């Protein structure tokens, strides 16, 4: 029916597909974080027979990787020696940039980034040049190239060539806390839950996994890019101290609509809630205290650590803002790290949202 599944069924799931059943202490606060997503879904966010089978699967899905990083640590005891240091971190709203960001830095020879295969299958990072050789990543390179061939994008979810960076997301998701899903679904009552917790046992989870994916590439510079850095900024200082963020900028107002317009062609067809005028107040909402958060917990770090793009200078000139941000944090950029880098309609009316409503609720955000 529309029920998505209980906390034991999701669980016996996860298992039944990849037969490991060893999911980790619940250091992370797990458990307590699925039965309030699991609450929501079910209690609030009006999910079709569609909507609750999608949600199925991501729930599932999010099981599995934590069960195979969990093993993952068990094959290579090692990655715990392994030390991340300055760490590159972007974060912002969708349509500001960070893409676009998150792609220039990760391309610098001498960084790395979480390569979509690897969020999806926790494991050290092979040669690069082993890759189209290797069982997993053809396995997974298969599955993206065929539900492309399916629908070309467009009308529900979206998936991400397996070479390409992925959102940190895909990693916080194996401890439930994430604020992709109230973006992509209504559900308050977790996005409430959220902001009241402390993210710093996920966090620990995340770099426990970049030491394990980046095992064999100790040597190179992690850069990520994910929204939760904006609600999640003390627990990312708390985990690595050192870090450098970079923050993308535009104002709300010229991209609120896009914001809705992405939500709503995405999640088309898997709720009679989270549509139009709803889509609007969740994500004024989200986005407002996403924000608001991040200035908040920034004032108490050293502003040496923090630097702020404009997506307008941005778009302009990116070697040059690259090249801007390097300087700032005292980096060295090589040639070869330049050359790797040079290579209908909607209205916020849709979304029961006005200019004037925007420009109040961002009002210097």
């Not at 980790?24 to 309030?36: C, F, H, I, K, P």
């Not at 999910?47 to 099981?63: D, E, H, I, Y």
């Not at 990312?236 to 535009?250: F, G, I, K, S």
């Not at 005028?277 to 608001?292: H, K, P």
């Amino acid at each position: 029916r529309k029920d998505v599944a209980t906390v034991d069924e999701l669980h016996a799931s996860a298992t039944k597909l990849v037969g490991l059943d060893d999911f980790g202490t619940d250091d992370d606060n797990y458990r307590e974080a699925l039965g309030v997503l699991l609450d929501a879904y079910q209690g609030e966010a009006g999910l079709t027979v569609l909507g609750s089978k999608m949600n199925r699967f991501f729930l599932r899905g999010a099981l599995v990787a934590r069960l195979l990083s969990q093993s993952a640590w068990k094959q290579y005891p090692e990655h715990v020696d392994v030390a991340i240091k300055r760490p590159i971190f972007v974060t912002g709203l969708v349509r500001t940039g960070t893409t676009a960001l998150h792609r220039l830095l990760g391309a610098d020879p001498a960084h790395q980034g979480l390569h979509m295969w690897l969020a999806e299958y926790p494991q050290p990072r092979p040669p690069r040049e082993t890759w189209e050789s290797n069982p997993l990543y053809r396995q997974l390179d298969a599955d993206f190239t065929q539900h492309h061939a399916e629908n070309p994008g467009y009308t529900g979810l979206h998936f991400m060539a397996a070479y390409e960076l992925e959102e940190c997301w895909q990693l916080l998701r194996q401890s439930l806390h994430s604020v992709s899903y109230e973006a992509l679904a209504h559900v308050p009552s977790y996005a409430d839950w959220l902001s009241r917790q402390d993210w710093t046992p996920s966090y620990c989870r995340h770099r426990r996994n970049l030491q394990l994916i980046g095992l064999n590439d100790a040597e190179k510079r992690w850069v990520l890019k994910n929204p939760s850095h904006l609600f999640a900024l003390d627990a990312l200082m708390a985990t690595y101290p050192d870090a450098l963020v970079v923050q993308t900028h535009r104002p709300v107002e010229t991209i609120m609509a896009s914001m809705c317009s992405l939500a709503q062609h995405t999640t088309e067809g898997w709720s009679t809630k989270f549509v139009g005028a709803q889509i609007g107040a969740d994500a004024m909402d989200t986005w407002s205290r996403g924000l608001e958060r991040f200035n908040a917990a920034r004032a108490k770090y050293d502003s040496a650590q923090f630097y702020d793009v404009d997506y307008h200078d941005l778009i302009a000139d990116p070697l040059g803002t690259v090249a801007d941000i390097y300087r700032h944090f005292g980096l060295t950029l090589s040639d070869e790290a330049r050359q790797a880098m040079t290579t209908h309609s909607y209205s916020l009316a849709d979304y029961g949202l006005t200019v004037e409503m925007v420009k109040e609720r961002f009002a210097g955000l």
